[PDB]
Design a protein around this nucleic acid. Structure first.
Ligand SMILES: CS[C@H]1O[C@H]([C@H](NC(=O)[C@H]2NC[C@@H]3C[C@H](CC(C)C)CCO[C@H]32)[C@H](C)Cl)[C@H](O)[C@H](O)[C@H]1O
Ligand SMILES: [K+]
Ligand SMILES: [Mg+2]
Ligand SMILES: [Mg+2]
Ligand SMILES: [Mg+2]
Ligand SMILES: [Mg+2]
Ligand SMILES: [Mg+2]
Ligand SMILES: [Mg+2]
Ligand SMILES: [Mg+2]
Ligand SMILES: [Mg+2]
Ligand SMILES: [Mg+2]
Ligand SMILES: [Mg+2]
Ligand SMILES: [Mg+2]
Ligand SMILES: [Mg+2]
Ligand SMILES: [Mg+2]
Ligand SMILES: [Mg+2]
Ligand SMILES: [Mg+2]
Ligand SMILES: [Mg+2]
Ligand SMILES: [Mg+2]
Ligand SMILES: [Mg+2]
Ligand SMILES: [Mg+2]
Ligand SMILES: [Mg+2]
Ligand SMILES: [Mg+2]
Ligand SMILES: [Mg+2]
Ligand SMILES: [Mg+2]
Ligand SMILES: [Mg+2]
Ligand SMILES: [Mg+2]
Ligand SMILES: [Mg+2]
Ligand SMILES: [Mg+2]
Ligand SMILES: [Mg+2]
Ligand SMILES: [Mg+2]
Ligand SMILES: [Mg+2]
Ligand SMILES: [Mg+2]
Ligand SMILES: [Mg+2]
Ligand SMILES: [Mg+2]
Ligand SMILES: [Mg+2]
Ligand SMILES: [Mg+2]
Ligand SMILES: [Mg+2]
Ligand SMILES: [Mg+2]
Ligand SMILES: [Mg+2]
Ligand SMILES: [Mg+2]
Ligand SMILES: [Mg+2]
Ligand SMILES: [Mg+2]
Ligand SMILES: [Mg+2]
Ligand SMILES: [Mg+2]
Ligand SMILES: [Mg+2]
Ligand SMILES: [Mg+2]
Ligand SMILES: [Mg+2]
Ligand SMILES: [Mg+2]
Ligand SMILES: [Mg+2]
Ligand SMILES: [Mg+2]
Ligand SMILES: [Mg+2]
Ligand SMILES: [Mg+2]
Ligand SMILES: [Mg+2]
Ligand SMILES: [Mg+2]
Ligand SMILES: [Mg+2]
Ligand SMILES: [Mg+2]
Ligand SMILES: [Mg+2]
Ligand SMILES: [Mg+2]
Ligand SMILES: [Mg+2]
Ligand SMILES: [Mg+2]
Ligand SMILES: [Mg+2]
Ligand SMILES: [Mg+2]
Ligand SMILES: [Mg+2]
Ligand SMILES: [Mg+2]
Ligand SMILES: [Mg+2]
Ligand SMILES: [Mg+2]
Ligand SMILES: [Mg+2]
Ligand SMILES: [Mg+2]
Ligand SMILES: [Mg+2]
Ligand SMILES: [Mg+2]
Ligand SMILES: [Mg+2]
Ligand SMILES: [Mg+2]
Ligand SMILES: [Mg+2]
Ligand SMILES: [Mg+2]
Ligand SMILES: [Mg+2]
Ligand SMILES: [Mg+2]
Ligand SMILES: [Mg+2]
Ligand SMILES: [Mg+2]
Ligand SMILES: [Mg+2]
Ligand SMILES: [Mg+2]
Ligand SMILES: [Mg+2]
Ligand SMILES: [Mg+2]
Ligand SMILES: [Mg+2]
Ligand SMILES: [Mg+2]
Ligand SMILES: [Mg+2]
Ligand SMILES: [Mg+2]
Ligand SMILES: [Mg+2]
Ligand SMILES: [Mg+2]
Ligand SMILES: [Mg+2]
Ligand SMILES: [Mg+2]
Ligand SMILES: [Mg+2]
Ligand SMILES: [Mg+2]
Ligand SMILES: [Mg+2]
Ligand SMILES: [Mg+2]
Ligand SMILES: [Mg+2]
Ligand SMILES: [Mg+2]
Ligand SMILES: [Mg+2]
Ligand SMILES: [Mg+2]
Ligand SMILES: [Mg+2]
Ligand SMILES: [Mg+2]
Ligand SMILES: [Mg+2]
Ligand SMILES: [Mg+2]
Ligand SMILES: [Mg+2]
Ligand SMILES: [Mg+2]
Ligand SMILES: [Mg+2]
Ligand SMILES: [Mg+2]
Ligand SMILES: [Mg+2]
Ligand SMILES: [Mg+2]
Ligand SMILES: [Mg+2]
Ligand SMILES: [Mg+2]
Ligand SMILES: [Mg+2]
Ligand SMILES: [Mg+2]
Ligand SMILES: [Mg+2]
Ligand SMILES: [Mg+2]
Ligand SMILES: [Mg+2]
Ligand SMILES: [Mg+2]
Ligand SMILES: [Mg+2]
Ligand SMILES: [Mg+2]
Ligand SMILES: [Mg+2]
Ligand SMILES: [Mg+2]
Ligand SMILES: [Mg+2]
Ligand SMILES: [Mg+2]
Ligand SMILES: [Mg+2]
Ligand SMILES: [Mg+2]
Ligand SMILES: [Mg+2]
Ligand SMILES: [Mg+2]
Ligand SMILES: [Mg+2]
Ligand SMILES: [Mg+2]
Ligand SMILES: [Mg+2]
Ligand SMILES: [Mg+2]
Ligand SMILES: [Mg+2]
Ligand SMILES: [Mg+2]
Ligand SMILES: [Mg+2]
Ligand SMILES: [Mg+2]
Ligand SMILES: [Mg+2]
Ligand SMILES: [Mg+2]
Ligand SMILES: [Mg+2]
Ligand SMILES: [Mg+2]
Ligand SMILES: [Mg+2]
Ligand SMILES: [Mg+2]
Ligand SMILES: [Mg+2]
Ligand SMILES: [Mg+2]
Ligand SMILES: [Mg+2]
Ligand SMILES: [Mg+2]
Ligand SMILES: [Mg+2]
Ligand SMILES: [Mg+2]
Ligand SMILES: [Mg+2]
Ligand SMILES: [Mg+2]
Ligand SMILES: [Mg+2]
Ligand SMILES: [Mg+2]
Ligand SMILES: [Mg+2]
Ligand SMILES: [Mg+2]
Ligand SMILES: [Mg+2]
Ligand SMILES: [Mg+2]
Ligand SMILES: [Mg+2]
Ligand SMILES: [Mg+2]
Ligand SMILES: [Mg+2]
Ligand SMILES: [Mg+2]
Ligand SMILES: [Mg+2]
Ligand SMILES: [Mg+2]
Ligand SMILES: [Mg+2]
Ligand SMILES: [Mg+2]
Ligand SMILES: [Mg+2]
Ligand SMILES: [Mg+2]
Ligand SMILES: [Mg+2]
Ligand SMILES: [Mg+2]
Ligand SMILES: [Mg+2]
Ligand SMILES: [Mg+2]
Ligand SMILES: [Mg+2]
Ligand SMILES: [Mg+2]
Ligand SMILES: [Mg+2]
Ligand SMILES: [Mg+2]
Ligand SMILES: [Mg+2]
Ligand SMILES: [Mg+2]
Ligand SMILES: [Mg+2]
Ligand SMILES: [Mg+2]
Ligand SMILES: [Mg+2]
Ligand SMILES: [Mg+2]
Ligand SMILES: [Mg+2]
Ligand SMILES: [Mg+2]
Ligand SMILES: [Mg+2]
Ligand SMILES: [Mg+2]
Ligand SMILES: [Mg+2]
Ligand SMILES: [Mg+2]
Ligand SMILES: [Mg+2]
Ligand SMILES: [Mg+2]
Ligand SMILES: [Mg+2]
Ligand SMILES: [Mg+2]
Ligand SMILES: [Mg+2]
Ligand SMILES: [Mg+2]
Ligand SMILES: [Mg+2]
Ligand SMILES: [Mg+2]
Ligand SMILES: [Mg+2]
Ligand SMILES: [Mg+2]
Ligand SMILES: [Mg+2]
Ligand SMILES: [Mg+2]
Ligand SMILES: [Mg+2]
Ligand SMILES: [Mg+2]
Ligand SMILES: [Mg+2]
Ligand SMILES: [Mg+2]
Ligand SMILES: [Mg+2]
Ligand SMILES: [Mg+2]
Ligand SMILES: [Mg+2]
Ligand SMILES: [Mg+2]
Ligand SMILES: [Mg+2]
Ligand SMILES: [Mg+2]
Ligand SMILES: [Mg+2]
Ligand SMILES: [Mg+2]
Ligand SMILES: [Mg+2]
Ligand SMILES: [Mg+2]
Ligand SMILES: [Mg+2]
Ligand SMILES: [Mg+2]
Ligand SMILES: [Mg+2]
Ligand SMILES: [Mg+2]
Ligand SMILES: [Mg+2]
Ligand SMILES: [Mg+2]
Ligand SMILES: [Mg+2]
Ligand SMILES: [Mg+2]
Ligand SMILES: [Mg+2]
Ligand SMILES: [Mg+2]
Ligand SMILES: [Mg+2]
Ligand SMILES: [Mg+2]
Ligand SMILES: [Mg+2]
Ligand SMILES: [Mg+2]
Ligand SMILES: [Mg+2]
Ligand SMILES: [Mg+2]
Ligand SMILES: [Mg+2]
Ligand SMILES: [Mg+2]
Ligand SMILES: [Mg+2]
Ligand SMILES: [Mg+2]
Ligand SMILES: [Mg+2]
Ligand SMILES: [Mg+2]
Ligand SMILES: [Mg+2]
Ligand SMILES: [Mg+2]
Ligand SMILES: [Mg+2]
Ligand SMILES: [Mg+2]
Ligand SMILES: [Mg+2]
Ligand SMILES: [Mg+2]
Ligand SMILES: [Mg+2]
Ligand SMILES: [Mg+2]
Ligand SMILES: [Mg+2]
Ligand SMILES: [Mg+2]
Ligand SMILES: [Mg+2]
Ligand SMILES: [Mg+2]
Ligand SMILES: [Mg+2]
Ligand SMILES: [Mg+2]
Ligand SMILES: [Mg+2]
Ligand SMILES: [Mg+2]
Ligand SMILES: [Mg+2]
Ligand SMILES: [Mg+2]
Ligand SMILES: [Mg+2]
Ligand SMILES: [Mg+2]
Ligand SMILES: [Mg+2]
Ligand SMILES: [Mg+2]
Ligand SMILES: [Mg+2]
Lengths: 48, 275
RNA sequence: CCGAGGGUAGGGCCCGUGACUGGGGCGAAGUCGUAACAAGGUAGCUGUACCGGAAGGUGCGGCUGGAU
RNA sequence: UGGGAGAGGGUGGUGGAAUUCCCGGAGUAGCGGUGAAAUGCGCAGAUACCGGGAGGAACGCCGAUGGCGAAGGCAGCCACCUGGUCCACCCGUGACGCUGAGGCGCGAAAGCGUGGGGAGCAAACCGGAUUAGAUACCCGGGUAGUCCACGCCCUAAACG
RNA sequence: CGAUGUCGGCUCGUCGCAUCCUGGGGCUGAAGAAGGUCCCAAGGGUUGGGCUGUUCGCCCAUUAAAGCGGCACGCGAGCUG
RNA sequence: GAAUGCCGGCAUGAGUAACGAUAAAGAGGGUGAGAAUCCCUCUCGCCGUAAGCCCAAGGGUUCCUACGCAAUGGUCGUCAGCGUAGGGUUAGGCGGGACCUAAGGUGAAGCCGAAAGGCGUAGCCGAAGGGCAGCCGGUUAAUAUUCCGGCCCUUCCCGCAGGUGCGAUGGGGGGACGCUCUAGGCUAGGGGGACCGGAGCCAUGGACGAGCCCGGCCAGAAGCGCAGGGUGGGAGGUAGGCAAAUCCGCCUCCCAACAAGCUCUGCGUGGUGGGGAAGCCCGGGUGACAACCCCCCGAAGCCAGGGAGCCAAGAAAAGCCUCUAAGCACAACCUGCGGGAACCCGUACCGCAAACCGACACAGGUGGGCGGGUGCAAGAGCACUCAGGCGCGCGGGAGAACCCUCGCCAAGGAACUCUGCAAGUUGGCCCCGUAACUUCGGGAGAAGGGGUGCUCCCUGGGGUGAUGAGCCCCGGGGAGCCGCAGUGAACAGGCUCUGGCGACUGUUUACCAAAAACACAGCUCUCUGCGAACUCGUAAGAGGAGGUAUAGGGAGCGACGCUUGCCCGGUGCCGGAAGGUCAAGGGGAGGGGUGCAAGCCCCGAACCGAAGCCCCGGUGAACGGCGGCCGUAACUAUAACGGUCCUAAGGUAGCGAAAUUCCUUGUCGGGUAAGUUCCGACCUGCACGAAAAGCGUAACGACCGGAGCGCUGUCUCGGCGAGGGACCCGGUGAAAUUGAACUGGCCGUGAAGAUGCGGCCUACCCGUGGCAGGACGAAAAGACCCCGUGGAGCUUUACUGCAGCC
RNA sequence: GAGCUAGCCCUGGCCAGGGUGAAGCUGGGGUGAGACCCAGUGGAGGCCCGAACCGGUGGGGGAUGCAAACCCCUCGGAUGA
């Protein structure tokens, strides 16, 4: 049937992207945490 | 003169439609129509704050002139009577000798080609506006400002009217459409006549679809829900209220008065509505 | 080909009959009250409406075929 | 052709008396009701009285043993629209009349539908009396209805 | 109770005998015929249908007869539900 | 050594199940170490409103080519969406950006919040909506409206010429809009041609023919032609469009007004440029100087912003035009012409799928366009087929049980069973015909029947053309012919009678319930006078509503019909300036501590003092509730009647063994041979009853009862047949489970149901196909039940708080 | 976290073909004028049959599946909430 992942580049970037994270206290903590953990990606890559 | 249908579908048994016989112009005045922003009952939080709204036909808002003391002493001609989907009354298109065009809500009896005017000197004819003090006692009136220069507030729905009953100093006494007697300031404007399209109350919507067209989504009885939803929720089988009948939010809904006690307008309400 | 009639399907009228049910007539000495005939003890009758174990009562309007 | 009387019908307007309710004043120990009472109402200020407001319904005297209409029925006053009818003159048509199965229309009250209205009155209903009982008569309440608009119903001691 | 699936049916049987029928008997208030009662006997047989989920039971039409009970109220790693 | 322990390794089950749609394969020839599996040819089959083609998302090199086969590929592999390498995506016009706005988002002003932050007019952002200039062909192994060729067009800059009061973010116009139905004329697409072009073909009995087979177009600027859209012109007045205005609006007059004129599109034609089949020969070459014409059908697309009708009344902003304001009028703008300038990103490939979402090359899921022909009434339905694309990445045999999917069946025909579950029957169209009841629509496709092919003959109207022929779509009449059978194949209702519930179409527990549940028009109660009530929010602010009592919130009831009775003592809610109680506060009789004292300090009675509560009333479509015992009639029985106790009042109409009746399969009647169900009645209603509505009701229902007809493999009662499996051989090769095992029957025993103990009986060793009685078989630390001073949801007149309100 | 699902907001798109035949309109009849009747025209509808599309009624299959909800037959809606 219709499953739960229906990918959408605009949706992805606008929901989880760098600018959406920076705009918000909780989003900026996410970036601070993933930097401290040393994540190679701070943000889900989407093509655009 | 509401129109019936023959029972050629189950719903057409009872459906009645307005006669529209008074309407003379069937597309609005482009210089007067804005987009009406449908809300669905949602506020600026995105939250539903008025349940069961949404999904009705698209509409354009017709800008209505509720001041009229705007244009004292400037006569206007009644060019068209038009359908307005944002209100129960019909509306009348006015061509002012100014060249300015305006919509008022159409009183009963108003005719295309007649003239109306507004101000302290206006004749007491249907469709004229005057401050309340200059309208003789006993006159049936509509589109009444509640406070001076603040805009017509009372008696605007199809068929309704207020009746001037007497004066007392700076104030006129009106029997509102609800039967309340209230002091209204005399400098408040009002329009001579009763609102038109009084057959409006006798329309039978006929089927569930019709309420959807008006943006009315289905109502759910509290008795149909569960306890997490509503005071009337739950119970094995059907169930009476089993407590004083309540709203979804717990307050009592049979009798419990709700007008604020220390409201300043109480000094101006003479007698509460009846019936 | 038509054709007595036999078959299939569906209608119409009539008769008889039916658990049970509705009132009706009748029947020497049953029970309840007393509505009408006298102003019958609330004048009566009336069309209708509502009510009441029952006759009845009452509302509205009508009639005199009502008294003093 | 010229006149007449009339609550004949329809629409709109409008006037005074009275009742109820509301407000203000004054005032106090009862009022109301009946055969007699009681329920009821009243010191939370009733009743009786004055002034003010609102609303509905009915139209005192004139009024009659009267008038009008086909019957049902029709009554404050005003205006409009409209019907029948009588009298005078003896002018016009020249039997064009009578009745009338069917048909059609009208049709008191009650009742019904949909809006409205709702003061007084009052089926139902409640209460107080009475009574053996009292699902009555009498008393205190009281909802339809009584009123308006439109549409039904089509009955009658619709009787002379 | 770190699970022994539970009514009825269907399918498949197998066993006990306190025997429904058929076989052998004694007694009879057994004339015959037909029965009653008890004894021996488990080899075989022991119907189709209406009602109800029913087991059971009642009823219809038969029958030599339309037996009763055990097998985890036999049988859901066989079915039904 | 145990923790259903943790991590890892390796066993068992087992050479077992499986190898992923039953659309299907066979042979010849190549290549190679190796071939059912790669390449080529012929034959066969499958899709063909797709299983073909084009877009969009998503994916991200998977594209093309050479070289490869360890792993990936459910087998094989020389092949591949796999490994290595190289190559490949070209734009002023296509799409997005340097344009516009929508929801929404963001946010100078401003508002609010302990902080973080929340709001918010303008403005900005934001598109698959608006706006805006490219068509046809050729070329590559791989890109093309991008390269090339042909013919067209857009904007920016500069210049020349002619013209004009030029000039905008400001004013105005326009842009600019629904649903159904739909006219005229066209195009797309298609059918036919005895006409035009073509390599050929004559078979096997016939045909050298008006024979067969193939094809007969595409694009095009100006001009022109047909068909449409849009649009009044002039004058005078003017206070309105937040400055101005010659524009727009409003008034007057004159003229043109089914017109015309102007303008803008579509289609046709059009200089010119291209394409061009079968067949044959090696993607190419020929065909070929290819021909390119006539007739008919014909859109849902085009003209278009067309027309009509209806009510539920149908975006915005820019581009564009007009008006003017500063300004400038040596400028500027408008038209025409010329030259120059014209950027950034995407473009490969897959895209109903093996490349996207489902862990897989997964029978599932994924939006838009095209979607040919014939016949079947129509159609996107169905059957077969075109173009094109496939045979689904294990095969070979065999022809057991059993399973799945399918075909048939004697006689019977529901006897099956909880139930006709399932499967039959019926089945399209045309015609005849059709009941109770009804809200007059319906019920209705009621039921039930007759016709249906082919040939010849006669003929009616509609379309095209011409009014004829021809083509075309509907027909009608007569006579015949054949078969068991003519919607001859495929697609295509079984029907009736009678109950219950719900009026109805709708909605629902994604993934065990589709229903009688929810909703629903409609009815009632109640709140709300507008800065409404109510809702979300600490607030600001929103929604309500740019609405205003014919409106909005809440609640119950649920079309419609006929109706909805009695109780206000209790709870609720509404009314009540008295009275009682009542907190902080006021008040301060009267005390107390301390100090030499002035004083400082503390307690403090009366009395004044809100809401709430008490108390007095009202209120049921508010929460709710609507009796008992005993007696009585001239047969009996039974009580219309009475007595008495109780209550706030004692259930009215209507209905009743019911979706409700315990006793119960109540009793009687109906239907049946037989009826615990059904239907109709009765009424001692365990325990109906009137908006948690009562009693009905035409129509409706994948709801749940009962009956009958039709027909059947449901059954008596099974039989045979088909294919996919099971079985055998070759290839690849799992699983849960598993203390170890050398693992028999009885009768006993044992923690009470023993392969494992005792006694006896039976039994040579090992497998293969089968069946399910046992291993208290597997799975799941029982969900029932209890226990834990475990947990969570829910309630209230449990306790105690809090928001909110007073 | 609303790329699943639920509701709403903005903007687009889709629904073969056939059947039934409301109002109105025209004409005729009828009448004092009317209501009204008849024919034609017309094309309404949470109207009917049925694809696409959206569903998921009954049964069968599947049950270490093709699939952590699928497949086959059947069945509901299909201009509308
Ligand atoms: C569905 S089969 C599925 O569950 C089974 C389980 N059985 C039981 O629990 C039984 N134990 C006794 C209990 C008694 C009651 C008495 C009765 C009066 C309530 C009968 C019901 O259960 C029985 C479920 C509950 Cl029937 C087995 O675990 C089976 O192994 C598994 O496969
Ligand atoms: K239980
Ligand atoms: Mg889904
Ligand atoms: Mg999606
Ligand atoms: Mg995207
Ligand atoms: Mg996107
Ligand atoms: Mg998105
Ligand atoms: Mg966001
Ligand atoms: Mg972002
Ligand atoms: Mg922060
Ligand atoms: Mg920070
Ligand atoms: Mg890095
Ligand atoms: Mg992140
Ligand atoms: Mg109607
Ligand atoms: Mg009707
Ligand atoms: Mg109107
Ligand atoms: Mg605008
Ligand atoms: Mg709004
Ligand atoms: Mg907002
Ligand atoms: Mg709300
Ligand atoms: Mg809402
Ligand atoms: Mg409104
Ligand atoms: Mg209107
Ligand atoms: Mg005021
Ligand atoms: Mg109404
Ligand atoms: Mg609407
Ligand atoms: Mg509603
Ligand atoms: Mg509801
Ligand atoms: Mg509930
Ligand atoms: Mg519930
Ligand atoms: Mg919740
Ligand atoms: Mg709660
Ligand atoms: Mg609650
Ligand atoms: Mg409850
Ligand atoms: Mg409930
Ligand atoms: Mg209950
Ligand atoms: Mg419930
Ligand atoms: Mg209760
Ligand atoms: Mg409550
Ligand atoms: Mg409140
Ligand atoms: Mg009021
Ligand atoms: Mg014969
Ligand atoms: Mg006696
Ligand atoms: Mg009497
Ligand atoms: Mg008497
Ligand atoms: Mg008398
Ligand atoms: Mg008497
Ligand atoms: Mg009485
Ligand atoms: Mg006093
Ligand atoms: Mg009044
Ligand atoms: Mg004479
Ligand atoms: Mg009458
Ligand atoms: Mg009357
Ligand atoms: Mg007495
Ligand atoms: Mg247990
Ligand atoms: Mg275990
Ligand atoms: Mg277990
Ligand atoms: Mg059986
Ligand atoms: Mg013997
Ligand atoms: Mg034996
Ligand atoms: Mg048992
Ligand atoms: Mg029994
Ligand atoms: Mg015998
Ligand atoms: Mg037994
Ligand atoms: Mg037992
Ligand atoms: Mg037992
Ligand atoms: Mg068992
Ligand atoms: Mg089982
Ligand atoms: Mg069982
Ligand atoms: Mg088992
Ligand atoms: Mg077992
Ligand atoms: Mg140990
Ligand atoms: Mg552990
Ligand atoms: Mg271990
Ligand atoms: Mg482990
Ligand atoms: Mg290791
Ligand atoms: Mg391991
Ligand atoms: Mg291993
Ligand atoms: Mg091994
Ligand atoms: Mg094995
Ligand atoms: Mg397997
Ligand atoms: Mg498999
Ligand atoms: Mg298949
Ligand atoms: Mg198959
Ligand atoms: Mg095969
Ligand atoms: Mg071959
Ligand atoms: Mg081969
Ligand atoms: Mg090979
Ligand atoms: Mg090989
Ligand atoms: Mg193969
Ligand atoms: Mg090949
Ligand atoms: Mg085709
Ligand atoms: Mg991928
Ligand atoms: Mg390999
Ligand atoms: Mg290999
Ligand atoms: Mg290698
Ligand atoms: Mg591999
Ligand atoms: Mg595989
Ligand atoms: Mg090789
Ligand atoms: Mg490439
Ligand atoms: Mg270019
Ligand atoms: Mg630039
Ligand atoms: Mg932009
Ligand atoms: Mg944005
Ligand atoms: Mg933008
Ligand atoms: Mg765009
Ligand atoms: Mg473009
Ligand atoms: Mg071009
Ligand atoms: Mg090359
Ligand atoms: Mg020049
Ligand atoms: Mg517009
Ligand atoms: Mg508009
Ligand atoms: Mg638009
Ligand atoms: Mg519409
Ligand atoms: Mg063309
Ligand atoms: Mg064709
Ligand atoms: Mg003009
Ligand atoms: Mg001016
Ligand atoms: Mg165009
Ligand atoms: Mg050549
Ligand atoms: Mg279309
Ligand atoms: Mg168009
Ligand atoms: Mg805007
Ligand atoms: Mg200047
Ligand atoms: Mg100059
Ligand atoms: Mg110019
Ligand atoms: Mg740039
Ligand atoms: Mg490309
Ligand atoms: Mg597909
Ligand atoms: Mg597609
Ligand atoms: Mg592929
Ligand atoms: Mg997933
Ligand atoms: Mg595959
Ligand atoms: Mg797939
Ligand atoms: Mg073709
Ligand atoms: Mg067909
Ligand atoms: Mg295959
Ligand atoms: Mg396939
Ligand atoms: Mg074999
Ligand atoms: Mg066959
Ligand atoms: Mg047979
Ligand atoms: Mg039969
Ligand atoms: Mg038969
Ligand atoms: Mg049966
Ligand atoms: Mg049945
Ligand atoms: Mg069943
Ligand atoms: Mg069949
Ligand atoms: Mg068929
Ligand atoms: Mg009939
Ligand atoms: Mg019948
Ligand atoms: Mg019938
Ligand atoms: Mg009926
Ligand atoms: Mg009828
Ligand atoms: Mg028919
Ligand atoms: Mg038929
Ligand atoms: Mg024939
Ligand atoms: Mg033939
Ligand atoms: Mg059918
Ligand atoms: Mg229903
Ligand atoms: Mg339901
Ligand atoms: Mg019902
Ligand atoms: Mg009903
Ligand atoms: Mg309903
Ligand atoms: Mg429907
Ligand atoms: Mg569930
Ligand atoms: Mg479910
Ligand atoms: Mg689930
Ligand atoms: Mg299911
Ligand atoms: Mg359910
Ligand atoms: Mg259903
Ligand atoms: Mg539900
Ligand atoms: Mg409901
Ligand atoms: Mg309903
Ligand atoms: Mg109702
Ligand atoms: Mg109401
Ligand atoms: Mg709140
Ligand atoms: Mg705070
Ligand atoms: Mg607003
Ligand atoms: Mg009826
Ligand atoms: Mg009470
Ligand atoms: Mg009370
Ligand atoms: Mg009370
Ligand atoms: Mg107080
Ligand atoms: Mg109670
Ligand atoms: Mg009580
Ligand atoms: Mg009772
Ligand atoms: Mg009563
Ligand atoms: Mg009654
Ligand atoms: Mg009974
Ligand atoms: Mg019943
Ligand atoms: Mg009961
Ligand atoms: Mg019973
Ligand atoms: Mg029972
Ligand atoms: Mg019985
Ligand atoms: Mg019987
Ligand atoms: Mg009884
Ligand atoms: Mg209730
Ligand atoms: Mg109930
Ligand atoms: Mg009730
Ligand atoms: Mg019914
Ligand atoms: Mg019915
Ligand atoms: Mg239904
Ligand atoms: Mg259903
Ligand atoms: Mg049957
Ligand atoms: Mg069979
Ligand atoms: Mg076979
Ligand atoms: Mg072998
Ligand atoms: Mg092998
Ligand atoms: Mg392998
Ligand atoms: Mg061992
Ligand atoms: Mg061992
Ligand atoms: Mg062994
Ligand atoms: Mg052994
Ligand atoms: Mg034991
Ligand atoms: Mg043992
Ligand atoms: Mg042993
Ligand atoms: Mg042992
Ligand atoms: Mg041993
Ligand atoms: Mg031992
Ligand atoms: Mg031993
Ligand atoms: Mg031993
Ligand atoms: Mg083997
Ligand atoms: Mg084996
Ligand atoms: Mg076993
Ligand atoms: Mg077993
Ligand atoms: Mg097995
Ligand atoms: Mg076992
Ligand atoms: Mg065990
Ligand atoms: Mg076991
Ligand atoms: Mg389990
Ligand atoms: Mg555990
Ligand atoms: Mg446990
Ligand atoms: Mg458990
Ligand atoms: Mg559970
Ligand atoms: Mg226990
Ligand atoms: Mg405790
Ligand atoms: Mg304890
Ligand atoms: Mg606890
Ligand atoms: Mg808790
Ligand atoms: Mg707190
Ligand atoms: Mg969504
Ligand atoms: Mg459709
Ligand atoms: Mg169509
Ligand atoms: Mg038809
Ligand atoms: Mg017609
Ligand atoms: Mg028309
Ligand atoms: Mg429909
Ligand atoms: Mg049909
Ligand atoms: Mg299914
Ligand atoms: Mg079936
Ligand atoms: Mg499953
Ligand atoms: Mg399926
Ligand atoms: Mg199917
Ligand atoms: Mg179907
Ligand atoms: Mg349908
Ligand atoms: Mg359709």
């Amino acid at each position: 049937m219709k499953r739960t992942w229906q990918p959408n580049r605009r949706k992805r970037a606008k929901t989880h992207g760098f600018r959406a994270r920076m705009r918000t206290p909780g989003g900026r903590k996410v970036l601070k945490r993933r930097r401290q953990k040393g994540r190679w990606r701070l943000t889900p890559a989407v093509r655009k | 003169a509401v129109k019936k249908f023959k029972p050629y579908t189950p719903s057409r048994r009872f459906m009645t439609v307005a006669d529209f016989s008074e309407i003379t112009k069937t597309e609005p005045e482009k210089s007067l129509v804005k987009p009406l922003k449908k809300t669905g009952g949602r506020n600026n939080q995105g939250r539903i704050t008025v349940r069961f709204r949404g999904g009705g036909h698209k509409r354009l808002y017709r800008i209505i002139d509720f001041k009229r003391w705007d244009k004292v002493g400037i006569p206007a001609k009644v060019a068209a009577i038009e359908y307005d989907p944002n209100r129960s009354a019909r509306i009348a298109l006015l061509h002012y000798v100014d060249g300015e065009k305006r919509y008022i809500i159409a009183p009963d009896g108003l005719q295309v080609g007649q003239q109306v005017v507004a101000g302290p000197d206006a004749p007491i004819q249907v469709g004229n506006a005057l401050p309340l003090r200059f309208i003789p006692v006993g006159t049936v009136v509509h589109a009444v400002e509640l406070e001076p220069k603040k805009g017509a507030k009372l008696a605007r729905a199809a068929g309704t009217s207020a009746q001037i009953q007497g004066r007392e100093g700076d104030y006129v006494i009106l029997r509102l459409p609800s039967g309340e007697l209230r002091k209204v300031h005399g400098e408040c404007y009002a329009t001579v006549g009763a609102v038109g399209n009084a057959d409006h109350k006798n329309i039978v919507l006929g089927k569930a679809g019709r309420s959807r067209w008006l943006g009315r989504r289905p109502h759910v009885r509290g008795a149909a829900m569960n306890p997490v939803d509503h005071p009337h929720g739950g119970g094995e089988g059907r169930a009476p209220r089993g407590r004083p009948p309540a709203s979804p939010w717990g307050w009592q809904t049979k009798g419990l008065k709700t007008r604020k006690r220390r409201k300043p307008s109480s000094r101006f309400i003479i007698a509460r509505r009846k019936k």
